[PDB]
């Protein structure tokens, strides 16, 4: 049986984001105010 | 320092878009399809291998298409629907990428391809040429 | 008397809900 | 690899959530019970038990249902309020959960299971089941 | 002098004779069916066997129903007409039956039984219960 064999000629390079944490929040500052 | 590659190893066309090209294999030992495709095609297309005879009113000119019985491997679990060869293309193959498939015994002195029923208009982008790596004369 | 022993079948959802200070600075 | 857990301690069905069944514990050695809900519970409930025997008539067919004197081992501090069984679902049972005992002194040869009054409007919602051990 | 064999095998509801529930078999590892009549039959009953999976809203609530395929079972002249693992009560089966068989592969976390088309009337006949081997 014919065992296929296909490879690819260009290729464009995989395209990824380089994603980092964000600056800290903190979740409750006391002094706050209402 | 490209070597002429034309003799020891030629190739021929089997498959133009419009209508196929019986190819004599007889002078060379062994043999292999690259098939490309030009266009996005739609679905997973199938094709059809043929092989020829010397027609005895001019035993240079091919005859009818006879269709090859291919064998199964030692490890091919679904296997054929008719006992007869085929060939498909998969579908979502790019172009600028090319595959190549070979019939794994010949049984005449010419290979045809054509398209089954159901893929015409679908296989009028896909070229199909042959190439050959011997001499044996 | 019939000794009741049992025994559970989810295994452990527990989500704790773990909890960490906040940012707290003073009392004024 | 599961094997044919059926025979060899198979199990039958006591309380299928409506009415009881007198389960056959004659051609067994030992036996016990397996309590499984399928909702909520209101409050703590509480079932019976009884024991029958091989009716006149057919000895095949279990005969009426006698209550089953429940007896103590060095511990009991509260006895049951008379000689009877009767088990009793906590208040805290859940659904994907099982609580599983026995009665240790079997009587007669059958086994059915009723609840007491009070709770059949919860006993709606458990599973009462019996599975054997003896080969005899 | 009978034990405790809730824990160490306990049993649940397959099939009460309206409806069936999927049985976990997470935490157990061998198990079977336990088939009993409660009367007379009229034609041979056939129940399909069907697999769940854990539901991707809460790890421990099942799925929908899955059919579970069977296996050859290679020392066998299996006369299967589709591969969907089933399994059928022969005529003339009474109600004092200790009729049990099991499923040669598991599939995955819930088992359940239902009947299949033809075996709906003397279905609600059979009275079907599953036992384990559980560990873990």
Redesign the interface.
């Known amino acids: ?10 290729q464009a390079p995989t395209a990824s984001r380089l994603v980092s944490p964000p600056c800290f929040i ?6 706050s105010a209402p | 320092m490209n070597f002429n590659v034309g003799v020891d190893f030629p190739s021929f066309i089997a498959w133009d878009g419009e209508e196929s090209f019986p190819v004599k294999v007889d002078g060379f030992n062994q043999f292999g399809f690259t098939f490309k495709t030009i266009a996005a095609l739609t679905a997973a297309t199938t094709f059809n291998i043929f092989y020829h005879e010397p027609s005895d009113a001019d035993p240079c000119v091919p005859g009818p298409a006879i269709r090859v019985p291919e064998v199964p491997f030692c490890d091919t679990v679904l296997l054929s629907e008719d006992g007869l060869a085929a060939v498909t293309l998969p579908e979502t193959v790019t172009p600028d990428s090319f595959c190549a498939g070979t019939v794994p015994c010949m049984n005449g002195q010419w290979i045809s391809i054509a398209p089954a029923t159901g893929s015409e208009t679908n296989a009028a982008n896909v070229q199909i040429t042959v190439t050959m790596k011997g001499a044996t004369r």
């Open positions: 049986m014919v065992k296929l064999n296909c490879r690819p000629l260009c903190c979740r409750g500052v006391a002094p």
